């Protein structure tokens, strides 16, 4: 037994000092010897701490010069040394396994459990023994891991290979010789004797382990940690504590992909005759299973037999030997992450993995049992825990012990200076360790005792808490909740720094619309008070940064008037213009107390002051000043937006909205796509670049804002002069900032003001050359700015080009031929458009203003709601413009009457395209509105919209892609909607699902969501009492539509899984009466109930017969269903009874396999001639046509329904007539109906004698 390299193993002192060695943790990185915890025979329960590995000289000399000090080039070079040596290490160390070592040789050493080499520092002196300088494990390299070694035992004198781990002394090639141990033990952390390196009468015995084989990646590591589950039934067994008594168990989780649960990891031991032998699970190797978290082995005997937990190690009767269902030869050594069975070594009790759960009184509980019965006859594959995840998780834990140990103290007293150093260190490392870097690290915080710990400790070091938080809280919106009671702290906190700022700063951009709104009123006293006390107005500053939706404004706005008295800005500000220039000169200085001091105020007053972009009078009227000359930092463009929101809001209807525009777009050779690819999916720069190259190969006073526009054009020219200078260095965000703001704005500026007779188009021929003369690793971070300038180039080019470009050659030039010319070079429609002007006035509307909003606006519903049966006059989007202003809130008590104007549901295509951008948004405004609303227009209106949109194309009803939320309107709607029901008159709950749910008009065109989609739903009223009204019709329909389909047999059950054989009762169990109670009806909602009830068998006949569930309806249901067939002349029953003939069908054709009931055909045949139908054609159709369709069989009809053949007379009376019945004369052209009815008398005639 000779040890080797990349092979490694545990050591123990000689004479008195012998202890197992064990790393303390990440909180505690200090060496501990223990003679009490262990011996040669016992190796502790978790000896895997201080699992060490022998390595060769891991050189860090080029690093060397990198580390001591650690120009710009120097850091690339010294760094290149760094990658040469850590990566050269790779190559050396991994290739190094299996090398013989003698004594005296110089070899580094890495730690298995912490992958850390032992470090001896000859400069610093340890803290426990003053004399042996510092002993510390240092992963990066160090001068001390490297060590001359010297032979303890005299038989292994110099010059043999170590065999059998000869106790011998090793010295780092740094401090001096041997190692030495001493009576030191600590007080807070006792149990652990000392390690030292000084001149010494001690000893060190080589215990074997971790070989050149070693882990060998091929076979399950003898001691690594490993989740356990099934190919067959996952059965991942966790050992969890419940009801206050330990449970071990396996079950269902609400694991092969992504990441499993944390308590699942369990440590592996390999049966071993000695403390620390080195091996793997092998056939006959034997098997050991502990609980890492608890350090508890499994011990699995009897409930027949079932697995019970061993708490204490070294028990053979708790061992198990593998079985395993796929045997394979390459490797006689078992395969890691391979399915595998296992069973008690020690009680003839074989482990069993099954659906049965041990737990009681638990639902979907965390155990499905699987306990070791004697049996002998599953599909589990051993999985282990990842080292990335185990060092990171390990860290959150140690971190934990610190923080808990460092708060508790805090509440208690003082942290102590030496302890002071280790806690402050702790928290800056955690900022380090925090690298939105990865999912397991940030999760670690919360689940592990990183945050949990912090949260114990919250009652310098604050900096560390904050940095860990923001880094590790990119995707976690839980910390917001801290603000209700933790916010108290911030006031004290607010006095110490602006750090809470950074937190508020992450939360304003990511979170908006009612996030601590009540705090907004408070936000005034904190931005004024936070400005004045801060001096630099930290708190306020971040406050302006956030901005947000409108919610900031209404509340935030208050603060500003306060600012006027509290800001008290009275030191040096006037000129009016010239002293501004002087001031830019004094501030210009780069070194200090110049550019830096002025800058804060500058960048802040620019962005913030731009602020209120949409309201003109606050910003437009207060901002009389917007007269800046040669400004910078794009403040102005945003300011301009502010002034702009007033008026301006001109909107747009799309350029092409007739038949001619299709012909134009086609003559133009497309092009919208060429722009639209870069822009739309640009992603990285290159996608857009391609469109650049192609583009390169080409050939040649309306308002007060105009005056500013001329200077704008000139400034654009000065950018173009900037462009002639071509450079990719700095300045791209001052030029590209000014220009980014400016450029979006230029789009908007060209479209908000323009010139006709080709003066706008001329500003365009020049803009063609500005757009022609404008301006990936680092270019991602840079690439946000770059995407802003390509998108603004596209926004200019899109508002001018698309909003109104290149449209006059045809409109402006025309040929006048044949009928007295007809060139230009809805009856009295022109007169109707001044009302359109009343619409443009309604778009720009501010609230709380007397003028005429009370009664005059009234809402021109009639005029707008009356206009009907016209063509999309190219302004569908013009229409659309009107709709957008009303999205603020739909609850104002009168909107509908005005909104009633909209009505006009006659042009679904044109409008629909416009409505396409806002479908998803219309679902969210439904969700908040449609969930409850009908201040409720949005629900009624959403209903109108689903009914019109439903009969508005096929692709549109199927394109919502169901990933658009559906289960949340059926469950969310279902929880308030199952309780409440709607009955006639005017049953409200008819079109929320059903009007859409009209299967694509006659009807089903795919059932997309016909199995997984109807995963669960709301209930129909039943048991005690009785069912509901004007929900029975649409409901029975709705039942057949929740799951119906020819592809999926799942439909018949998912529409009526419950019935099977008793369905009929609920309808025979009072149908009309239900209709009666809610709306006074009865037979109306029962008869309607039977239209929709009807057509389950002959329509979507596929949602029916394909899977067999005919145990109790083939014989007992055919005579029973008849119960209640006494209707007559019922229109409501006409979609049931009169539509039965047509709409409700399927009995005789659908069942021909069993013939055990009789005499039904007679009562039916009588019923068809009593109630009637339309003249001749329907009469035959209601009774004769079901006969022609049905008639195919021939023999099956004659065997039953003795004398059932009443319908033959229909062909002489019912099937023929004059033009209709007697001589009414309704259907002019009959060759289609009679021609289709005669090719059906041939297709019908073809098979009668020998069916089909």
Swiss-Prot record:
Which stretch of the full-length chain is present here? 7 to 1493 of 2749
Domain MIR, chain residue ranges per copy = 98-152, 159-209, 217-271, 278-325, 331-385
Name of the protein in its database record:
Inositol 1,4,5-trisphosphate-gated calcium channel ITPR1
Query: Where do the annotations place 1D-myo-inositol 1,4,5-trisphosphate binding?
Result: 251, 253-254, 443, 446, 476-477
Tell where it localizes: Endoplasmic reticulum membrane; Cytoplasmic vesicle, Secretory vesicle membrane; Cytoplasm, Perinuclear region
Task: Point out the gene that encodes the protein.
Answer: Itpr1
Regarding how it is modified after translation, the entry says: Polyubiquitinated. Polyubiquitination targets ITPR1 for proteasomal degradation. Approximately 40% of the ITPR1-associated ubiquitin is monoubiquitin, and polyubiquitins are both 'Lys-48'- and 'Lys-63'-linked. Phosphorylation by cAMP kinase (PKA) enhances calcium release. Phosphorylation by PKA increases the interaction with inositol 1,4,5-trisphosphate and decreases the interaction with AHCYL1.
- What do the Gene Ontology cellular component annotations say? calcineurin complex; cytoplasm; endoplasmic reticulum; endoplasmic reticulum membrane; nuclear envelope; nuclear inner membrane; nucleolus; perinuclear region of cytoplasm
Binding-site residues for Ca(2+) 1, renumbered to this chain: 656, 927, 930
């Amino acid at each position: 037994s000779f040890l080797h390299i990349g092979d490694i193993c545990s050591l123990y002192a000689e004479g008195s000092t012998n202890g197992f060695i064990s790393t303390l943790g990440l909180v505690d990185d200090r060496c501990v010897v223990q003679p009490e915890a262990g011996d040669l025979n016992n190796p502790p329960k978790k000896f895997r701490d201080c699992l060490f590995k022998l390595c060769p000289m891991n050189r860090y000399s080029a690093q060397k010069q990198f580390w001591k000090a650690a120009d710009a080039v120097l850091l690339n070079k010294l760094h290149h040394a760094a990658d040469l040596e850590k990566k050269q290490n790779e190559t050396e160390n991994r290739k190094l396994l299996g090398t013989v070592i003698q004594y005296g040789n110089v070899i580094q050493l890495l730690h298995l459990k912490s992958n850390k080499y032992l470090t001896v520092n000859k400069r610093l002196p340890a803290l426990l023994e003053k004399n042996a300088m510092r002993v510390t494990l240092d992963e990066a390299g160090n001068e001390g891991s490297w060590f001359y070694i010297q032979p303890f035992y005299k038989l292994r004198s110099i010059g043999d290979s170590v065999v059998i781990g000869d106790k011998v002394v090793l010295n780092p090639v740094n401090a001096g010789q041997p190692l030495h141990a001493s009576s030191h033990q600590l007080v807070d952390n006792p149990g652990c004797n000392e390690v030292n390196s000084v001149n010494c009468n001690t000893s060190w015995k080589i215990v074997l382990f971790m070989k050149w084989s070693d882990n060998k990646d091929d076979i399950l590591k003898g001691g690594d940690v490993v989740r356990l589950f099934h190919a067959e039934q996952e059965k991942f067994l966790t050992c969890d504590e419940h009801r206050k008594k330990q449970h071990v168990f396996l079950r269902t989780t609400g694991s092969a992909t992504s990441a499993t649960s944390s308590k699942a990891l369990w440590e592996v031991e390999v049966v071993q005759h000695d403390p620390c032998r080195g091996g793997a699970g092998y056939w006959n190797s034997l098997f050991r299973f502990k609980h890492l978290a608890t350090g508890h082995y499994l011990a699995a005997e009897v409930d027949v037999y079932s697995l019970v937990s061993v708490p204490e190690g070294n028990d053979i009767s708790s061992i198990f030997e593998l079985d395993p269902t796929t045997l394979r030869g390459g490797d006689s050594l078992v395969p890691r992450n391979s399915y595998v069975r296992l069973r008690h070594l020690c009680t003839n009790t074989w482990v069993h993995s099954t659906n049965i759960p041990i737990d009681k009184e638990e639902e979907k509980p965390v155990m499905l049992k699987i306990g070791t019965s004697p049996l002998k006859e599953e599909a589990f594959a051993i999985v282990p825990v990842s080292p990335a995840e185990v060092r990171d998780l390990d860290f959150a834990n140690d971190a934990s012990k610190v923080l808990g140990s460092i708060a508790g103290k805090l509440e208690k007293g003082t942290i102590t200076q030496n302890e002071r150093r280790s806690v402050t260190k702790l928290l800056e490392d955690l900022v380090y360790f925090v690298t939105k870097p990865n999912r397991e690290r940030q999760k670690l915080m919360r689940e592990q005792n990183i945050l949990k710990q912090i949260f114990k400790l919250l009652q310098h070091i604050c900096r560390l808490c904050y940095r860990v938080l923001r880094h590790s809280q990119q995707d976690y919106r839980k910390n917001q909740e801290y603000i209700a009671k933790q916010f108290g702290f911030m006031q004290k906190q607010i006095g110490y720094d602006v750090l809470a700022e950074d937190t508020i700063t992450a939360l304003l951009h990511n979170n908006r619309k009612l996030l601590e709104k009540h705090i907004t009123a408070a936000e005034i006293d904190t931005f004024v008070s936070l400005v004045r006390k801060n001096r630099e107005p930290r708190f306020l500053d971040y406050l302006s940064d956030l901005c947000v939706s409108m919610n900031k404004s209404i509340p935030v706005t208050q603060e500003l008037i306060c600012k006027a008295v509290l800001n008290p800005t009275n030191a040096d500000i006037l000129i009016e213009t010239k002293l501004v220039l002087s001031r830019f000169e004094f501030e210009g200085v780069s070194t200090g107390e110049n550019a830096l001091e002025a800058g804060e105020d500058e960048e802040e007053v620019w962005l913030f002051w731009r602020d209120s972009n949409k309201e003109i009078r606050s910003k437009s009227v207060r901002e009389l000043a917007q007269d800046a000359k040669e400004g910078q930092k794009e403040d102005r463009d945003i300011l301009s937006y502010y002034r702009y929101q007033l008026n301006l809001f001109a909107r747009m209807c799309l350029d092409r909205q007739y038949l001619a525009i299709n012909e134009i777009s086609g003559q133009l050779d497309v092009d919208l796509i060429l722009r639209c690819m870069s822009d739309e999916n640009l992603p990285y720069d290159l996608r857009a670049s391609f469109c650049r190259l192609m583009l390169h190969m080409h050939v040649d006073s309306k308002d007060e804002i105009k005056e500013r526009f001329a200077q704008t054009m000139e400034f654009v020219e000065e950018y173009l002069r900037d462009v002639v200078c071509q450079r990719f260095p700095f300045s791209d965000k001052e030029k590209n900032k000014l220009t980014f703001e400016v450029v979006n704005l230029a789009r908007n500026l060209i479209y908000f003001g323009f010139y006709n007779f080709s003066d706008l188009l001329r500003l365009t021929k020049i803009l063609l050359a500005i757009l022609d003369c404008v301006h990936p690793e680092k270019e991602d971070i840079m690439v946000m700015d770059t995407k802003l300038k390509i998108i603004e180039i596209l926004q200019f080019i899109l508002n001018v080009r698309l909003d109104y470009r290149i449209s006059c050659l045809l409109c402006i030039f025309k040929r006048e031929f044949d009928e007295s010319n007809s060139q230009s070079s809805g009856a009295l429609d022109f007169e109707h458009i001044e009302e359109q002007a009343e619409g443009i006035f309604g778009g720009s509307e501010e609230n709380t203003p007397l003028d005429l909003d009370d009664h005059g606006g009234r809402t021109f519903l009639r005029v707008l709601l009356h206009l009907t049966m016209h063509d999309y006059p190219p302004l569908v989007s013009g229409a659309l413009q009107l709709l957008f202003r009303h999205f603020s809130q739909r609850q104002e008590v009168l909107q509908a009457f005005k909104q009633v104007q909209l009505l006009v549901t006659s042009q679904d295509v044109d409008n629909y395209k416009q409505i396409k951008q806002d479908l998803d948004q219309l679902r969210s405004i439904v969700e908040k509105s449609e969930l409850w609303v009908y201040v409720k227009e949005i629900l009624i209106r959403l209903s109108k919209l689903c009914v019109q949109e439903s009969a508005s194309v096929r692709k549109s009803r199927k394109q919502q892609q169901r990933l658009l939320r559906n289960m949340g309107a059926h469950a969310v709607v279902l929880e308030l909607l199952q309780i409440p029901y709607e009955k006639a008159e005017d049953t409200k709950m008819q079109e929320i699902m059903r009007l859409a749910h009209e299967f694509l008009q006659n009807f089903c065109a795919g059932n997309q969501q016909n199995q997984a989609l109807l995963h669960k739903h709301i209930n129909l009223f039943l048991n005690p009492g009785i069912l509901e009204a004007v929900t029975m019709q649409h409901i029975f329909m709705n039942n057949f539509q929740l799951c119906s389909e020819i592809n999926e047999r799942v439909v018949q059950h998912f529409v009526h899984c419950i019935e099977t054989h008793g369905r009929n009762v609920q309808y025979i169990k009072f149908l009309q009466t239900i209709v009666k109670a809610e709306g006074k009806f009865i037979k109306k909602c029962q008869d309607m109930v039977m239209a929709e009830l009807v057509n389950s068998g002959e329509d979507v006949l596929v949602f029916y017969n394909d899977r067999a569930s005919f145990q109790t309806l083939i014989q007992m249901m055919r005579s029973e269903r008849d119960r209640m067939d006494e209707n007559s002349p019922l229109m409501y029953h006409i979609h049931l009874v009169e539509l039965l003939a047509v709409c409700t069908e399927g009995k005789n054709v659908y069942t021909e396999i069993k013939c055990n009931s009789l005499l039904p055909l007679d009562d039916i045949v009588r019923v068809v001639t009593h109630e009637d139908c339309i003249p001749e054609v329907k009469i035959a159709y209601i009774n004769f046509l079901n006969h022609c369709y049905v008639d195919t069989e021939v023999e099956m009809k004659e065997i039953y329904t003795s004398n059932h053949m009443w319908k033959l007379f229909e062909n002489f009376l019912v099937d023929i007539c004059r033009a209709c019945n007697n001589t009414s004369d309704r259907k002019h052209a009959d060759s289609i109906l009679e021609k289709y009815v005669t090719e059906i008398v041939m297709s019908i005639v073809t098979t009668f004698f020998s069916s089909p």
